[PDB]
Amino acid sequence: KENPMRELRIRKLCLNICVGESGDRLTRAAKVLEQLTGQTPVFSKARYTVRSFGIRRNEKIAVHCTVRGAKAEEILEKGLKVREYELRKNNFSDTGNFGFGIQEHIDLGIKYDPSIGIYGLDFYVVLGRPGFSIADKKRRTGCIGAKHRISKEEAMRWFQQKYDGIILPG
Amino acid sequence: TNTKGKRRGTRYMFSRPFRKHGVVPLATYMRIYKKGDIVDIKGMGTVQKGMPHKCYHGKTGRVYNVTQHAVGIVVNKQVKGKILAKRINVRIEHIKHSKSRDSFLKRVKENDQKKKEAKEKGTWVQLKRQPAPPREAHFVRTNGKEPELLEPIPYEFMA
Amino acid sequence: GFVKVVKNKAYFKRYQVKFRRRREGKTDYYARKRLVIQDKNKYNTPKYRMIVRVTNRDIICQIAYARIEGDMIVCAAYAHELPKYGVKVGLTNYAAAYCTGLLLARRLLNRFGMDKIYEGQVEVTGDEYNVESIDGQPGAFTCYLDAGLARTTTGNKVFGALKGAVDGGLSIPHSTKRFPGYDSESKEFNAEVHRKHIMGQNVADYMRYLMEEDEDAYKKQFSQYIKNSVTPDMMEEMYKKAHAAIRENPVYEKKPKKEVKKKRWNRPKMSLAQKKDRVAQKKASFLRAQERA
Amino acid sequence: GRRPARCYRYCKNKPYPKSRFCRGVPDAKIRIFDLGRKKAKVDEFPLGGHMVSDEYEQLSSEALEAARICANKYMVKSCGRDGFHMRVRLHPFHVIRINKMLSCAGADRLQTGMRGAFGKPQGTVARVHIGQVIMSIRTKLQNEEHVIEALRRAKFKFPGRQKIHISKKWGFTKFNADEFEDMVAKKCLIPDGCGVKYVPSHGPLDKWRVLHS
RNA sequence: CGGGGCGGACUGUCCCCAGUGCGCCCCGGGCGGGUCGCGCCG
RNA sequence: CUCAACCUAUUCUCAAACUUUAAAUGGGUAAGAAGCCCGGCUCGCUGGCGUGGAGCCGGGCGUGGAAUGCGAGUGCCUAG
RNA sequence: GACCCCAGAAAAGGUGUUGGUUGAUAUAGACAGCAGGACGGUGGCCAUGGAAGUCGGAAUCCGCUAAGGAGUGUGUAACA
RNA sequence: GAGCAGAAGGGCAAAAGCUCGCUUGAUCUUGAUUUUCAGUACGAAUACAGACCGUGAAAGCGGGGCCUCACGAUCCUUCU
RNA sequence: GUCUACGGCCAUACCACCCUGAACGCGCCCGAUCUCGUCUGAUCUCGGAAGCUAAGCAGGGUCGGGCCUGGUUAGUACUUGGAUGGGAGACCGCCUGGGAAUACCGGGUGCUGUAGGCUU
RNA sequence: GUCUCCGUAGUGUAGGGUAUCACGUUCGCCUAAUACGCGAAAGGUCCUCGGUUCGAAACCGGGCGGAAACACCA
Ligand SMILES: [K+]
Ligand SMILES: [K+]
Ligand SMILES: [K+]
Ligand SMILES: [K+]
Ligand SMILES: [K+]
Ligand SMILES: [Mg+2]
Ligand SMILES: [Mg+2]
Ligand SMILES: [Mg+2]
Ligand SMILES: [Mg+2]
Ligand SMILES: [Mg+2]
Ligand SMILES: [Mg+2]
Ligand SMILES: [Mg+2]
């Protein structure tokens, strides 16, 4: 009934880890993303100086990576397994894309190394349909259109159908 | 007391018209400016290079020199009690062809051709344009309708 | 409602739309001005430019000059007329880009009558070639490449079209930094792997590459190459024959077709009377439905 | 310490509003512009009376405050506290200046005379034109004589000549009284608060069907 | 102020329910301008 | 239940250093013979081209190409 | 009171007089004068020390009626 | 509704803003012109022309800063 | 009747939502050996042709917003010139010419150039 | 009116990258007890608002207070 070009699918998984300050902590956090994603992470500087958070401007504060393709799908199932395939409905967003956070990186895949820290990580998957790339395109870029957009309700079905997930009322 | 700055008092003159900012349309670059043609000096503010001074905005002159991007214009300026012909270099963004000279050239072509046709068939035709003559006599028909009688209205206080 | 509506009535009242072709994402008016505008002291001398546009399935090569009423195209060549001679499959690649650029060059020179003079580089080599005007003969046609919005990195197909045109006889200012043979680290143009790209040897290697690792993947990728048996070993000869056929007959003939009816496929605009009747009916239906309760 | 109002009666200067160039302006004397039962609906107070100026002049914020109080006390006396609604329709947006000279027996003490004479903000006045409405009162239709007398008393607090006019509009609306009721009947007008909303016969029909439903 | 016959499109009356426009031809009434125009009157 | 903030559609009153819109008066230019139209020649400038542009040389066109009024142009010396 | 500039006056008033606008009453007898009636519940309720129609807060009704306001003012401590 | 060094005004969106890459046209020259104006100078600016370069695939753009301010005769000294 | 490439004017063209789209086309789409770029073949670059018009795109619709153009507002506001006009003034009237702008009420919703396709 | 300077622990004061000193206050020691003395702790919108800045007590514009110096020649 539905067109094959309307099928929902994962655009990117967008792992992010934010630490307080630049230092060995950030470098070891970068290795944490590198081992999980098999991919070189990128550091993010602080936009402003905040004395309360003890961060200075243009200081490396966080490390983040974007994972696409089958690699993203395999990372998502590990993280969902940490949350026992149970996502709260507030986590799903109005734009049609959801995210969850994992407190401990060590539990899934990677053995703890004494050099490596105890860092957790942040998941935010972006859900898309075929043809969403027209917005990114340089030539003749355009908006996707209302019917082709993904709603919060559609994302919730996708989790409930693909991962037999449970959306708790929270 | 007033400053002598080149752009003093040009807040509105060099500003763009409402909802006509941004990219300059390219037909203004494709216009052809020969020597001896008459151009009006606007002076748009989007292009800051080759701008005319504020005293030439709204003036009309004759092109005497053509360069890669600008033209040389002989334009009359009045200084106290003397009018003297200034020569100014203005980029083509700030000028456009004057239609006063274009309409007169059309009329000359009509006049010269009309004279030619008149000689070929014989009789005489009027070439000069005359001032609006007094209205000729005419009849105005009532058409069986009495003209409506108008009356000044009484005054009463609006608001 | 808890946040100010940004796109309120006042937002649209002050909104200035961009140019139509800027809104469509087709024309870079910053680059277009520098490409189409002639010096005022050159007057009505045309400024020619080679428009190269690579489509998902086609390559379009046009030569045009700007006029106030719009661009005037003096000659056009397409990659979809390549099957008229030799190459019928694997269009919109670098080799086809060279062929359509060469076809545009030969077709334009034929129309102007300058084929015997300015033969161009008949023997295809990737090295830098530039045509020089011959004294006592009409000058070489000079035009400039209009890449459009394409990212002009090394190995872009728009430069393959440029290479075909300059080898065809057109004088287009360029350098070899953007040809596939250019080496970034050594700042050296190989001029031999560029010739391989012109002959589609990168594609030919890919076909014989995919043959030895995964057979069905090769069939998936080069499915239409299998039809009419276009094999890696015959690709260079196919492109040489295509170039020679371009040289011999570059003239374009059009298919006539007038045996067409006026079938209208778009709904016509509704008239004012129909709009008011529709509102009248909808008003009446709502009131009538209310009386049903 | 205020000068006599005759010194600032006439609109002699260009408008001089309180802005980023005119700083340090003392607040105006009048801070309240609506009194009475402001929450009364449009049908409650059909009759509207205006005070209209015949003179192009300046009205001080103190005078507007005095006339607003004078009209309020009489209406409360004659119509009850909830029997009317008054709207002052002039806001003192024009700042008047004073070039203050030392009022001592000596010009030697840096009176400076007329040097650097541009004054400091001294007050705010409202610029009124001929035919402009100064004050408006809406009430029931049997209080017409009380509206006229209340507006008559407030005239004595103003410099120039003012006329009392009983408008043909319904209340504070801009629609005629005789066409007001049937316009509401055919839903051209919809009441909100103390005013009405004109509903044009254009726009989406979805708003047309929320009416008539 | 409108009449006849064929293509689209609209309405929550959808039993051949109701309504609107356009493309061709056949008619009906009124109005204005030119017409060797043609007569009569001044 | 009420009072706030917020949003939405309205409502009163304003701007020398605000503005979508926008006069009257006003400023510039044009209303021909130094013009128009035919041919031709030169160029080291321009150039796909007999191109483009400019200059030069001959020839033909007077219904003198709005009104009104007035004779104009030009130089030196120069007081107060 | 008495003529451009110009040489002195405002707000606010007048049952002086003249003109005008709007509204109202009137032979089913207006207006003004002179002469009678101007009641019962009810000295209506809450305020109280007396407040009875008249120092005040709310209400504003009934009957006889031709007509009487559960009150316009004088007055009384309140009455009268 | 940001930013473009600063006062304000104008201008600017695959910009003139932000980030990268390569660079030194912020270089050597003659005239013309604009602005103030006496139509003198300085300062600033515009359009060219001749070199030598930078950048880009190229068209092109660049002889300082997006534009409106940011500066200095004779005599003398100092350097090239 | 339409589309593609390049455009001119730059909303009658924009914005929101809905419906339809035959054939070419334009796309979405598949892939990363080569060219070339990425934290990520997402973008860019390259090689393709299984699928799809869902989306872009085109046409249409909406008592749609905006925009464009009319009427009204209104010969009103304002204004050139004139008077030994009025008025204590503030200001106002008249003569002589010119003459707007909201609210409110209608109509319209891209035209078109060059080159090349599809449409029995 | 003109011109200049200063607002920081309870007091008097120092000083564009997490606020100093002394007195004072609190707690514990010594003393029969207080004081002295000894050992520890706490205390500060840097007058207010706006701006520059990554960052303001600081730097700049304002506004609140306080302290100065002037106002002469007839
Ligand atoms: K000044
Ligand atoms: K000034
Ligand atoms: K100068
Ligand atoms: K160059
Ligand atoms: K020297
Ligand atoms: Mg510059
Ligand atoms: Mg570019
Ligand atoms: Mg006094
Ligand atoms: Mg003044
Ligand atoms: Mg140069
Ligand atoms: Mg509309
Ligand atoms: Mg007039």
Swiss-Prot record, chain A:
Record PTM N6-acetyllysine, positions in chain: 45, 78
Single GO MF descriptor: structural constituent of ribosome
Domain of life of the native organism: Eukaryota
Location(s) in or outside the cell: Nucleus, Nucleolus; Cytoplasm
PROSITE patterns, sorted: RIBOSOMAL_L5 (PS00358)
GO BP annotation list: cytoplasmic translation; negative regulation of proteasomal ubiquitin-dependent protein catabolic process; negative regulation of protein neddylation; negative regulation of ubiquitin protein ligase activity; negative regulation of ubiquitin-dependent protein catabolic process; positive regulation of gene expression; positive regulation of protein binding; positive regulation of signal transduction by p53 class mediator
GO cellular component, as recorded: cytoplasm; cytosol; cytosolic large ribosomal subunit; cytosolic ribosome; extracellular exosome; membrane; nucleolus; nucleoplasm
Pfam families associated with the record: Ribosomal_L5, Ribosomal_L5_C
Gene3D superfamilies linked to this entry: 3.30.1440.10
Record bears the keyword Ion transport: no
Classification via InterPro entries: Ribosomal_uL5 (IPR002132), Ribosomal_uL5_C (IPR031309), Ribosomal_uL5_CS (IPR020929), Ribosomal_uL5_dom_sf (IPR022803), Ribosomal_uL5_N (IPR031310)
PTM-bearing positions, type Phosphothreonine: 37, 40
Assigned keywords, A-Z: Acetylation, Cytoplasm, Diamond-Blackfan anemia, Disease variant, Isopeptide bond, Nucleus, Phosphoprotein, Ribonucleoprotein, Ribosomal protein, RNA-binding, rRNA-binding, Ubl conjugation
Positions bearing the Glycyl lysine isopeptide (Lys-Gly) (interchain with G-Cter in SUMO2) cross-link: 31, 45, 147
Family designation: Belongs to the universal ribosomal protein uL5 family.
NCBIfam families in the cross-refs: PRK04219.1
Name listed for the protein in its UniProt record: Large ribosomal subunit protein uL5
Organism: Homo sapiens
Curated annotation (Swiss-Prot), chain B:
InterPro entries from the UniProt entry: Ribosomal_eL21, Ribosomal_eL21_CS, Ribosomal_eL21_sf, Translation_prot_SH3-like_sf
GO cellular component terms, A-Z: cytoplasm; cytosol; cytosolic large ribosomal subunit; cytosolic ribosome; endoplasmic reticulum; membrane; synapse
Residue span of region Disordered: 111-144
Position of the signal peptide: none
Entries under Gene3D superfamilies matching the protein: 6.10.250.3260, Ribosomal protein L21 (2.30.30.70)
Gene Ontology BP term (one): translation
Keyword Ribosomal protein listed: yes
Any Pfam family matching the protein: Ribosomal_L21e
Basic and acidic residues bias (residue ranges): 111-122, 135-144
Main subcellular localisation: cytoplasm
Swiss-Prot/TrEMBL keywords: Cytoplasm, Disease variant, Endoplasmic reticulum, Hypotrichosis, Ribonucleoprotein, Ribosomal protein
Gene Ontology terms for molecular function: RNA binding; structural constituent of ribosome
Compartments, record wording: Cytoplasm, Cytosol; Cytoplasm; Endoplasmic reticulum
The keyword Cell membrane appears for this protein: no
Record family assignment: Belongs to the eukaryotic ribosomal protein eL21 family.
PANTHER family, A to Z: 60S RIBOSOMAL PROTEIN L21 (PTHR20981)
Assembly notes: Component of the large ribosomal subunit.
Disorder named in the UniProt entry: Hypotrichosis 12: A form of hypotrichosis, a condition characterized by the presence of less than the normal amount of hair and abnormal hair follicles and shafts, which are thin and atrophic. The extent of scalp and body hair involvement can be very variable, within as well as between families. HYPT12 patients have normal scalp hair density at birth. Hair loss begins during the first 6 months of life and gradually progresses to nearly complete loss of scalp hair. The remaining hairs grow slowly and are thin, sparse, dry, and fragile.
Protein name from the UniProt record: Large ribosomal subunit protein eL21
Organism: Homo sapiens
Swiss-Prot record, chain C:
Listed GO MF terms: 5S rRNA binding; mRNA 3'-UTR binding; mRNA 5'-UTR binding; RNA binding; structural constituent of ribosome; ubiquitin ligase inhibitor activity; ubiquitin protein ligase binding
Keywords: Acetylation, Cytoplasm, Diamond-Blackfan anemia, Disease variant, Isopeptide bond, Nucleus, Phosphoprotein, Ribonucleoprotein, Ribosomal protein, RNA-binding, rRNA-binding, Ubl conjugation
Modified-residue entries (N6-acetyllysine), positions: 4, 47, 219
Phosphothreonine found at: 231
GO CC annotations on file: cytoplasm; cytosol; cytosolic large ribosomal subunit; cytosolic ribosome; endoplasmic reticulum; extracellular exosome; focal adhesion; membrane
Numbered residues of crosslink Glycyl lysine isopeptide (Lys-Gly) (interchain with G-Cter in SUMO1): 219
Regions of compositional bias (Basic residues) in chain numbering: 257-267
Positions of post-translational Phosphoserine modification: 184, 271
Record Pfam families: Ribosomal_L18_c, Ribosomal_L5e
Gene3D superfamilies the UniProt entry points to: 3.30.420.100
Any one of the GO BP annotations: positive regulation of translation
Superkingdom assignment: Eukaryota
Region (Disordered): 252-293
Main location: cytoplasm
Modified residues (N-acetylglycine): 1
Cross-link (Glycyl lysine isopeptide (Lys-Gly) (interchain with G-Cter in SUMO2)), chain numbering: 219
Localization (cell): Cytoplasm; Nucleus, Nucleolus
Presence of keyword Membrane: no
Family to which the UniProt record says this protein belongs: Belongs to the universal ribosomal protein uL18 family.
Disease named in the record: Diamond-Blackfan anemia 6: A form of Diamond-Blackfan anemia, a congenital non-regenerative hypoplastic anemia that usually presents early in infancy. Diamond-Blackfan anemia is characterized by a moderate to severe macrocytic anemia, erythroblastopenia, and an increased risk of malignancy. 30 to 40% of Diamond-Blackfan anemia patients present with short stature and congenital anomalies, the most frequent being craniofacial (Pierre-Robin syndrome and cleft palate), thumb and urogenital anomalies.
UniProtKB/Swiss-Prot annotation, chain D:
UniProt key word Cytoplasm: yes
InterPro entries noted in UniProt: Ribosomal_uL16 (IPR047873), Ribosomal_uL16_CS_euk_arc (IPR018255), Ribosomal_uL16_dom (IPR016180), Ribosomal_uL16_euk_arch (IPR001197), Ribosomal_uL16_sf (IPR036920)
Pfam families named in the record: Ribosomal_L16
Keywords annotated in UniProt: Cytoplasm, Differentiation, Disease variant, Meiosis, Ribonucleoprotein, Ribosomal protein, Spermatogenesis
Tissue expression from the record: Almost testis-specific. Also expressed in pre- and postmenopausal ovary.
GO cellular component: cytosol; cytosolic large ribosomal subunit; endoplasmic reticulum; membrane; nucleus; ribosome
Single GO molecular function: structural constituent of ribosome
Biological process terms in GO annotation: cell differentiation; male meiosis I; ribosomal large subunit assembly; spermatogenesis; translation
Localization per record: Cytoplasm
Subunit structure: Component of a male germ cell-specific 60S large ribosomal subunit (LSU), which contains RPL10L and RPL39L, instead of RPL10 and RPL39 paralogs. The composition of the rest of the complex is similar to classical ribosomes.
Note: This gene has no introns in its coding regions, and therefore was most likely produced by retrotransposition of the original X-linked gene during evolution.
Disease with which this protein is associated in UniProt: Spermatogenic failure 63: An autosomal recessive male infertility disorder characterized by severe oligozoospermia and reduced progressive sperm motility.
Family listed: Belongs to the universal ribosomal protein uL16 family.
Protein name per UniProt: Ribosomal protein uL16-like
Organism listed in the record: Homo sapiens (Human)
Gene this chain is encoded by: RPL10L
